[PDB]
Amino acid sequence: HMATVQQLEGRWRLVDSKGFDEYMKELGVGIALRKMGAMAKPDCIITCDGKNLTIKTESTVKTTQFSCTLGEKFEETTADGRKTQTVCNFTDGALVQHQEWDGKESTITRKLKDGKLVVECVMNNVTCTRIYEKV
């Protein structure tokens, strides 16, 4: 020191955190988003062009949704933070996943349609389709 601002530029990778959960709580961050925040190894990117300063974050969130035996009911912990009663079946060429929690209910279907992974979700009256391509 004294450090210039050019000394802070580049990519920085998280290696230690303390009290972050508490910090998010004091901002008013909800539990689900909080757990997401703490499971992410964010990269911080800083650049400074004279007085002009930019800060970017880049976090990958590698996560196991669930492991299960087909046909065996289990307790799922979801990304949004529900504790559901889930059973998966491979039925008629499709991978069905049925979620029960709080008396509510959702089904998620996964089929192969023209080499693409068509994913279909259903709750009450609300549906949703996602297409994936193989890597």
Residues with Cβ within 8 Å of residue 91, at least 6 apart in sequence: none
CA–CA dist 39, 27 (Å, integer): 18
20 or 74, CB closer to Cl ion? 20
Maximal C-alpha separation, the chain:
68
Which of 16, 22, 80, 133 touches ligand A9M by CB under 6 A? Answer: 80
CA–CA dist 20, 12 (Å, integer): 17
20 counts as binding Cl ion under rule CB under 5 A = yes
Which of 5, 11, 17, 85 touches Cl ion by CB under 5 A? Answer: 17
Contacts with ligand A9M by CB under 6 A lie at 24, 27, 29, 33, 36-37, 40, 42, 44, 55, 57, 59, 78-80, 108, 110, 119, 121, 130
Which residues make up each annotated binding site for hexadecanoate?
Answer: 132
